Write an enzyme that holds these catalytic residues in place. Structure first.
Site, PDB file in Angstrom:
ATOM      1  N   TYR A 116       0.848  -1.183   0.000  1.00  0.00           N
ATOM      2  CA  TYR A 116       0.000   0.000   0.000  1.00  0.00           C
ATOM      3  C   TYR A 116       0.887   1.237   0.000  1.00  0.00           C
ATOM      4  CZ  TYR A 116      -3.351   3.536   1.506  1.00  0.00           C
ATOM      5  OH  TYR A 116      -4.131   4.667   1.593  1.00  0.00           O
ATOM      6  N   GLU A 204      -3.671   7.370  -4.018  1.00  0.00           N
ATOM      7  CA  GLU A 204      -3.632   6.120  -3.265  1.00  0.00           C
ATOM      8  C   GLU A 204      -3.450   4.966  -4.234  1.00  0.00           C
ATOM      9  OE1 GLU A 204      -7.214   4.229  -1.381  1.00  0.00           O
ATOM     10  OE2 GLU A 204      -6.148   4.641   0.487  1.00  0.00           O
TER      11      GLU A 204
END
Ligand SMILES: CC(C)(COP(=O)(O)OP(=O)(O)OC[C@H]1O[C@@H](n2cnc3c(N)ncnc32)[C@H](O)[C@@H]1OP(=O)(O)O)[C@@H](O)C(=O)NCCC(=O)NCCS
Ligand SMILES: [Cl-]
Ligand SMILES: [Mg+2]
Lengths: 393, 303
Positions: A116, A204
């Site tokens: 991530y 993101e």
């Protein structure tokens, strides 16, 4: 605003960020020719809708599944023929689905490691921050809940820019090794520049990962944009996809009105963000459910009041309207005129609870009194909320 | 340090104010209202219009010329979003002690860059942007708040919402308490003054005997304020603090009108802020309509 998968991945690709090779197709033959031009071992065909759950979705053609893998370009075209022009229904869509006008024909990449990585402005440190976790491919705040030691942050100086030691350390904390760590560090630097270039509030990437062939790739991403910067990001906001939005919010966007639909039956007409939030709160505290949030502040013009009011009356959920104005820069008489004229050319048919304070409130109340409209005047916030709740089923 | 400029928050009758965006629509109107209120508005700036008069006051091409020619100690900014960050930067560059930015809509990245310069100097104190301004009732009004609802008194008010400031002012005036100083710090995510900055001024001000803090979803400024109060508003002579936090019912992931009012990533919720403030001895009014009565009761119980 909202972007399709192919729009944000093209935005990333044009700025040196590594994504899977892809084309976008508007017809089945276009998807077939795109699959041929890809020269890829395996190809993924993805219907382009904003909502999630495309993998388990059903098209109005009968085709099951919005994401298909194949090695045959002719299969890509045939399956796209059962996609384009049809509605795709998923777990996240209305039951009649969403029309698929475009499909993505992309090289299917295998994924051997998921991390991530996000970039956003940190309010505590007053600058950009890298937020990463070697535990990719899941909900990020789920990781923060059970494994906060696996969340890594790099505070970046906006004037200094991202440093190679910052990019390298995050790539190391994400779990990339050797040449893949250098590749990930360079991608983080290109993600940072993209983040600043497009006035994003957040870039993101999840999963930020690598292929078995040793390439660091941004397999999927979401970009949130700063609405305050639309005047200098017009080419990107022109790409906005409003086809899956609440249609009343689409109408609000046409007139630059801050409208957010909710699930209640008490419409809210407020001139401040705090007051509007407080209005929703106090309606709930007195047993009601607000139908919407509405922030109509600044130098509000009577035409904005006219449109906003028509917007609230067009919502079939609305059983009553609460007008709550404490005007400072807002002149209360502008509110009173826009409402009275609106109720002229609209025929008001729901209870109207009105509370006005501040700039030129006395002249505004006189406009409402001489209007003959069915108005229930309120004394304060509590009285306004209780009277609005009393007006509905 | 930048905290050295905190004292510039306390405008008074001797504050002298220039207006950036003086000749614009809102700059002209609220300059008129400031003059009718009694604010020492001495001039203003608009690039390219220096050497003109406006409302009988001189217009200047730069903040620096305006400051030197009038002795101004405060500037209020009514400059559109594409240029307001440069207007703030010019005022910092001119070392204006107090700068109040009303503008809503400044790009967040612009304000990140403004704050980078702001935090590395101690001459200029910035309030805003996206804020209603600051008022010393009966002495100095710098902003857009309706002056007629104010009353010189003993409650200090700091708020991320302009309209909720008016609520607190109106309620505390109705119960007779009045206000010492009101500071609207605005609803943007990056600004020049937070709750702690105003709380430091309120706790050291003898005219301030009670405090109303108005917050909302987003950020952690209310949490930082609670920590400040735990360490500096205990002791024998604590001042009562009443609060209201907007957004108990706001949905997650949406910016609720303010650029800074958003719950994201499990952060920024109003309930956590209420809990943080209560743990610091703050009496949180559940209803926004009861701020005046809640702090009144605290003044009664405190004899
Ligand atoms: C700031 C704001 C009020 C300006 O709107 P406005 O007054 O109607 O706009 P105008 O165009 O008429 O006036 C702006 C003026 O600033 C001038 N200006 C531009 N750049 C400038 C600069 N760097 N320095 C000084 N003045 C500048 C412009 O030239 C213009 O003046 P002019 O018309 O004489 O040429 C508006 O953008 C805004 O933010 N509104 C919402 C405010 C709000 O609600 N805040 C929250 C309160 S809680
Ligand atoms: Cl401190
Ligand atoms: Mg506002």
């Amino acid at each position: 605003m909202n972007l399709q998968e192919y729009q944000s991945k093209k935005l990333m690709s044009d700025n040196g960020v590594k994504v899977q090779r892809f084309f976008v197709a508007d017809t089945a033959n276009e998807a077939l020719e795109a699959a041929k031009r890809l020269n890829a071992k395996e190809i993924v065909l993805k219907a382009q809708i904003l909502a999630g759950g495309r993998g388990k979705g059903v098209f109005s053609s009968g085709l099951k599944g919005g994401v298909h893998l194949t090695k045959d370009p002719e299969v890509v075209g045939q399956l796209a023929k059962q996609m384009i022009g049809y509605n795709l229904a998923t777990k996240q869509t209305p039951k009649e689905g969403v029309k698929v006008n475009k499909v993505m024909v992309a090289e299917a990449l295998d994924i051997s490691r998921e991390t991530y990585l996000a970039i956003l402005m940190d309010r505590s440190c007053n600058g950009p921050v890298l937020v990463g976790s070697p535990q990719g491919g899941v909900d990020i705040e789920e990781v923060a809940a059970s494994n906060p030691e696996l969340i890594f942050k790099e505070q970046i100086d906006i004037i200094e820019g991202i440093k190679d030691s910052q990019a390298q350390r995050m790539a190391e904390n994400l779990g990339f090794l050797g040449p893949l760590q250098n590749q990930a560090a360079d991608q983080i630097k290109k993600l940072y520049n993209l983040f600043l270039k497009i006035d994003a509030t957040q870039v993101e990437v999840n999963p930020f990962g690598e292929t078995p062939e040793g390439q660091v790739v941004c397999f999927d991403a979401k970009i949130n944009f700063d609405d305050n910067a639309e005047f200098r990001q017009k080419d990107i906001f022109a790409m906005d996809d409003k086809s899956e939005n609440e249609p009343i919010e689409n109408e609000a966007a046409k007139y630059d009105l801050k409208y957010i639909g909710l699930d209640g039956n008490i419409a809210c007409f407020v001139n401040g963000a705090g007051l509007a939030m407080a209005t929703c709160d106090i309606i709930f505290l007195n047993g009601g459910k607000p139908a919407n949030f509405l922030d109509l502040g600044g130098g509000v013009k009577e035409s904005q009041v006219y449109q906003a009011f028509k917007l609230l009356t067009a919502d079939p959920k609305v059983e009553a309207i609460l007008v709550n104005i404490f005007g400072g820069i807002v002149n209360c008489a502008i509110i009173a005129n826009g409402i009275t004229k609106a109720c002229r050319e609209l025929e008001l048919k729901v209870p109207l609870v009105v509370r006005l304070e501040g700039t030129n409130v006395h002249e505004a109340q006189n406009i409402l009194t001489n209007s003959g409209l069915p108005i229930t005047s309120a004394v304060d916030l509590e009285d306004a909320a209780k009277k609005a709740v009393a007006s509905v089923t | 340090s930048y905290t050295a400029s905190r004292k510039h928050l306390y405008v008074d009758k001797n504050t002298k104010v220039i207006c950036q965006g003086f000749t614009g629509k809102q700059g002209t109107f609220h300059s008129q209202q400031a003059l009718e209120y009694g604010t020492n508005l001495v001039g203003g700036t608009t690039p390219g219009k220096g050497g003109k008069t406006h409302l009988g006051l001189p217009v200047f091409n730069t903040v620096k010329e305006a400051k030197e020619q009038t002795g101004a100690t405060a500037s209020v900014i009514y400059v559109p979003p594409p240029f307001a960050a440069a207007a703030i930067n010019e005022a910092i560059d001119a070392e204006v002690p107090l700068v109040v930015c009303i503008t809503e809509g400044i790009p967040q990245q612009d304000m990140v860059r403004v704050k980078h310069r702001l935090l590395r100097q101690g001459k200029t104190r910035l309030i805003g942007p996206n804020c209603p301004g600051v008022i010393n009732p009966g002495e100095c009004k710098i902003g857009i708040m309706p002056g007629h609802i104010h009353k010189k008194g003993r409650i200090g008010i700091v708020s991320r919402s302009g309209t909720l400031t008016y609520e607190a002012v109106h309620q505390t005036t109705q119960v007779g308490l009045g206000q010492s100083l009101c500071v609207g710090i605005g609803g943007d995510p990056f600004n020049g003054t937070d709750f702690t900055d105003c709380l430091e001024i309120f706790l050291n001000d003898p005219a301030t005997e009670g405090i109303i803090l108005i917050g909302e979803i987003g950020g952690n400024a209310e949490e930082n304020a609670a920590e400040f109060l735990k360490q500096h508003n205990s002791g024998p002579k604590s001042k009562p603090v009443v609060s209201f936090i907007a957004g108990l019912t706001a949905p997650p992931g949406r910016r609720m009108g303010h650029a800074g009012a958003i719950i994201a990533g499990g952060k920024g919720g109003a309930k956590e802020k209420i809990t943080a403030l209560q743990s610091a001895g703050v009496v949180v009014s559940m209803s926004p309509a009861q701020l005046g009565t809640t702090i009144y009761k605290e003044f009664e119980k405190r004899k």
